[PDB]
Amino acid sequence: KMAFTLADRVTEEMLADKAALVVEVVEENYHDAPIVGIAVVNEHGRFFLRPETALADPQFVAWLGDETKKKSMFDSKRAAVALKWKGIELCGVSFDLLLAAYLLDPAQGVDDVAAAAKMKQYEAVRPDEAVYGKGAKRAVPDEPVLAEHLVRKAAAIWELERPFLDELRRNEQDRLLVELEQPLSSILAEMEFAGVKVDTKRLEQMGKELAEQLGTVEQRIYELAGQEFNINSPKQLGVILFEKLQLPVLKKTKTGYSTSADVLEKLAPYHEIVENILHYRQLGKLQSTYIEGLLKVVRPATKKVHTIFNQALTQTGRLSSTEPNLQNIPIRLEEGRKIRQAFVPSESDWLIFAADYSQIELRVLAHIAEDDNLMEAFRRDLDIHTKTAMDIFQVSEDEVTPNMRRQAKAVNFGIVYGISDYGLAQNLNISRKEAAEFIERYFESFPGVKRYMENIVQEAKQKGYVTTLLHRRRYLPDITSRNFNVRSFAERMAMNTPIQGSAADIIKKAMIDLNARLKEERLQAHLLLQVHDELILEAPKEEMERLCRLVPEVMEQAVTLRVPLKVDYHYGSTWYDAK
DNA sequence: GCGATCAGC
DNA sequence: ACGCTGATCGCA
Ligand SMILES: Nc1nc2c(ncn2[C@H]2C[C@H](O)[C@@H](COP(=O)(O)OP(=O)(O)OP(=O)(O)O)O2)c(=O)[nH]1
Ligand SMILES: [Ca+2]
């Protein structure tokens, strides 16, 4: 019902200088995953190619790797990484329909070509789920069915580039696609393929020690409980805490008693068992998610873990990281932080180098809000988190601990993103009127921040969306909802998205600038991870001194704001040591 | 499969 | 009743 050549060999007319290209990888995790078929649509026709022939054809491989032969694709990072695992380089991607759809409207949740095509009233293509099936029934269909699907997806991409580019241009997002997200996709593909090396001997020994400590704590909980029970069972735990031990009920869930850590911490004066339950959970969290989970995904022959950075998922323009998530490796408690000792350089005599933007969203907010006092604070290189901790806990600078500062951090961001007196009082364990007067004092010091938050909510109502500094967009239909609670969540999104999203814009530009600089200096150093406002690299030890000057400078100069950007950086023989 | 929970930013 | 996430696991 769509014509195409089911080709047995590659021909010259398949190798035009512009084409839509589909390199199909069906497995969710595309690392070392099979390529099940290829389609090309260009000015000369539509073609389906079997990968075992196309990817062993030297002319097709050369075409793939020629940056002057332009390809339009959907999720080009998936194809590039899968091809890297086949020993093949993909260059010349000039249009990525996934990233274009994501910029136009992140809320569509576009996960396949059919979903993107629907945005422009193109429906001559099926959803991938309809072709491949779900769950245990998922399967590559018969070749004529597969080939037509890949050809229809390629035809859709061929047709849709122009209407997507037109709307991107109207939104002031066409350079955001072509000069930011598409170049970033290639950099992320390199990062994911490189992977991070793991010291599995250390992780395994940590897991054995964790298991013993878990037993010791488990028994102590049984003794304090007077009985043995399933500590992981909410119904049993709730019974033990709030029926057998008769502890106060401070909070309920939709199905029973809450036992979240904030509740447990508040019950510490009443019974020693609650702090043991906290210790028990934290140990089990390390064991399940970061020892066992990481060992499950390490590639045994190389001892590398290969995350996938989802570039078209979050509603603010951040990345997310999956299987494993390398953006939430423990750091705040000392026993958890030691997991980072298992993240090592991939070569001998290389080291890990980490750099982080200082107080990034507050600096962005100062610029965007043009708050005279907040701008002056960063022009003085003040630490606003430390300043707030001094005021909260009524201490001097010298006596601010790592945990007090992390708590003042939640107060700072809470207040500028709409926390209520109730929420603030519940976080600082202070009276509600003390919380409300602190918030009032806060906005007396930063009245330009308060004005900005009022103005941006009105702007979201008037336009229907908010934007970031590099013109990322988020629609907020609920901002005019009649329901107070629905409308309120949308107002806090209007407050937060331009700030968090602009910080996401800045680090993405920094990554592109950094790679260009590393190439220009002919350095072996390369990116391994991004953690929202942090970049992690590895490099030969002989490159560290040059990197200490290079990397902070590129990051600091990525954009020019009304306040300085500041970068903290460290290096060491493991990720643990790079701080 | 979902919701609570908790690890990060 | 600040925002943005992903993984685990019991299921009231
Ligand atoms: N709404 C909200 N955003 C947060 C929170 N924690 C972190 N973020 C966002 C905003 C932060 O500026 C950004 C980077 O987080 P960091 O932990 O690195 O803190 P920040 O850069 O502000 O300070 P620092 O690096 O310690 O000088 O991530 C939070 O509790 N609430
Ligand atoms: Ca930071």
Author numbering: 298 to 876
How did the manuscript describe this experimental structure?
Polymerases generate nascent strands of genetic material by stepwise phosphoryl transfer of nucleotides to primer termini, yielding O3′→P5′ phosphodiester linkages. We reported that 3′-NH2 primer extension can be catalyzed by a modified DNA polymerase, yielding N3′→P5′ phosphoramidate DNA (NP-DNA). The large fragment of DNA polymerase I (BF), cloned from the thermophilic soil bacterium Geobacillus stearothermophilus (Bst), acquires nontrivial levels of N3′→P5′ polymerase activity via two surprisingly minor substitutions: (A) a single active site mutation (F710Y) and (B) substitution of its divalent Mg2+ cofactors with Ca2+ (1). To add evidence that a single divalent metal ion cofactor catalyzes unnatural NP synthesis in BF, a polymerase A family member, we carried out a single nucleotide primer extension reaction in intact crystals.
Reactions were then initiated in the intact crystals by pH-shift from an acidic mother liquor (pH < 6) to a basic soaking liquor at pH 8.8, and reacting crystals were quenched at various times by flash freezing. Conformational changes in both the upstream and downstream nucleotides flanking the nascent bond are linearly correlated with covalent bonding. The downstream conformational change in the dGTP substrate sugar from C2′- to C3′-endo upon product formation, however, was not observed in an equivalent time-resolved experiment with the wild-type enzyme, in which the conformation is stably C3′-endo. Unlike for native phosphodiester catalysis, only a single metal ion cofactor is detectable by crystallography during NP catalysis.
